[PDB]
């Protein structure tokens, strides 16, 4: 029973291992194993539940263990190990074959097979930790191991793609430990975590690995948003080390999402409005990306309201996620009509729900835009309106107060009007008739480069896959 369960999963694990083993030996095929490693994460997670945990025990006995004998016992110690044929050396699949890691040449240390075996061993360990939700001592113990090992080994083009996915588990397992319980050991552990990311990021800079630098930047930018340091986030994004070529669309959407929150506090909403739109287009529409689409769609509504523009109501209607978008709908109506008591009671009841995503702190800045939008509505309907006529609409304090809210408006060129005090009314300065000026021609020249921007990323990408057609033989 238990014997047939251990040998079945190990054969499938070696079968997937031999596919990426022969591809890294000859020249550089490394682009190919990257596609296999995408499905390796999903196929291993479903396989971990079946045939219990014993698939990883016989795999370590098969190959040579540099560090991995005591790590399995420590991993099995927390789960109250059940010992069945647990003596090392019970299962031997090598049987002296070249693709099986021939034992005599391996045990005599005349050849080194540890490079691809050890780096692959740490990957399967991190998969079971996230599946079994093992925390506390097992989180810190594995962090003290993998990091010094990566500094000792010299990573090639294919080796840099191994640990590229391991850095995500280091930051993920560290944040789940802090949110579960707060302790002095968690704050000091985060200090080493921050200094470690910057040391390896410099290593990947010389190797110019696309997937490695894409995973690190996404983890580093998130650490800046938690601490809220402006000087660290602004200086990091000025280097522009993020490759846009071979990185996945899921890694791209996460990058544009960080730039929207950073530029939101910089009081420049022109660039931040484009970054939140590009993050939606790059993110897939499947169910696994709904977690990113849920947070990104909530940030888009906050960026629009801070620009003075009001987002469409169909976004809160035709979508299927509007159940969580209900708090933002009442904020939309309160800004339009400019009601004083409507916004106060709106943010009071939902104060608890908006605290989770930290979007309630941005609602304080939304209060200023409540009247600023109402001023734009009354200014477009009335070209010349008396000073006392505005206070009768929005029920403001006094005519002395409303005069200075239009002040903050046209400083940046929002309303584009003038206040005549002697005449006693506010007149709109826009005469339209701007088609004959050269101001539209400035934007017109940008649309030519936008269509030309699609050339170099396209015409060059035709022959890119085509080199395999002429080299391979055809019927």
């Amino acid at each position: 029973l238990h014997h047939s369960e251990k040998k079945y999963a190990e054969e499938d694990q070696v079968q997937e291992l031999l596919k990426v083993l022969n591809e890294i030996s000859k020249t550089t095929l490394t682009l190919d194993p990257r596609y296999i490693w995408r499905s390796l994460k999903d196929l291993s997670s479903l396989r971990n539940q079946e045939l219990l945990n014993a698939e990883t025990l016989c795999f370590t006995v098969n190959v040579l263990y540099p560090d991995s004998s005591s790590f399995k016992k420590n991993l099995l110690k927390f789960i109250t190990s059940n010992h069945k044929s647990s003596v090392p050396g019970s299962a031997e699949l090598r049987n002296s074959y070249p693709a099986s890691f021939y034992s005599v040449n391996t045990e005599k240390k005349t050849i080194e097979v540890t490079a691809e075996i050890n780096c692959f061993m740490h990957l399967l360990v991190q998969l079971f930790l996230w599946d079994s939700k093992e925390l506390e001592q097992l989180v810190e113990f594995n962090r003290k191991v993998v990091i010094p090992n990566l500094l000792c080994y010299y990573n090639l083009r294919s080796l840099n793609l191994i640990n590229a996915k391991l850095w995500f588990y280091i930051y993920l397992s560290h944040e789940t430990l802090a949110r579960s319980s707060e302790e002095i050991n968690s704050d000091n552990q985060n200090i080493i975590l921050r200094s470690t990311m910057m040391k390896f990021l410099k290593i990947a800079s010389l190797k110019h690995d696309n997937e490695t630098k894409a995973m690190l930047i996404n983890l580093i930018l998130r650490d800046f948003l938690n601490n809220g340091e402006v000087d660290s986030a602004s200086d990091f994004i000025s280097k522009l080390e993020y490759p846009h070529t071979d990185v996945s669309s899921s890694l791209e959407a996460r990058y544009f999402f960080y730039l929207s929150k950073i530029n939101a506090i910089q009081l420049d909403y022109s660039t931040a409005n484009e970054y939140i739109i590009a993050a939606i287009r790059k993110a897939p529409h499947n169910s696994k990306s709904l977690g990113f689409l849920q947070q990104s769609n909530k940030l888009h509504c906050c960026i629009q309201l801070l620009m003075g523009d009001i987002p469409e109501l169909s976004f809160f209607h035709q979508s299927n996620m509007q159940k969580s978008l209900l708090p933002y709908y009442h904020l939309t109506k309160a800004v339009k009509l400019g009601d004083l008591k409507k916004f106060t009671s709106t943010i009071t009841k939902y104060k608890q729900l908006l605290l989770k995503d930290d979007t309630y702190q941005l609602c304080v800045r939304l209060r200023s835009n409540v009247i600023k939008t109402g001023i734009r509505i009354i200014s477009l309907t009335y070209k010349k309106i008396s000073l006392r006529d505005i206070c009768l609409k929005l029920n403001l304090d006094s005519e002395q107060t409303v005069e200075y809210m239009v002040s903050r408006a046209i400083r940046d060129g929002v309303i584009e009007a003038k206040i005549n005090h002697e005449d006693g009314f506010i007149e709109t300065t826009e005469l339209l008739n701007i088609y004959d000026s050269e101001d539209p021609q400035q934007v017109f020249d940008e649309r030519i480069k936008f269509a030309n921007q699609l050339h170099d990323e396209y015409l060059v990408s035709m022959r890119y896959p085509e080199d395999k057609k002429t080299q391979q033989n055809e019927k």
Binding site: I310, L313, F315, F316, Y329
Partner: peptide, 27 residues
């Protein structure tokens, strides 16, 4: 799709529309 569906108006129903008939004779 903006300022259209659910917000509506909540005016121009009866009382405001019925008042405009009396203004014709008051001129």
């Amino acid at each position: 799709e903006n300022w259209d569906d659910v917000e509506v108006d909540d005016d121009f129903t009866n009382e405001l529309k019925a008042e405009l008939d009396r203004y014709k004779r008051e001129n």
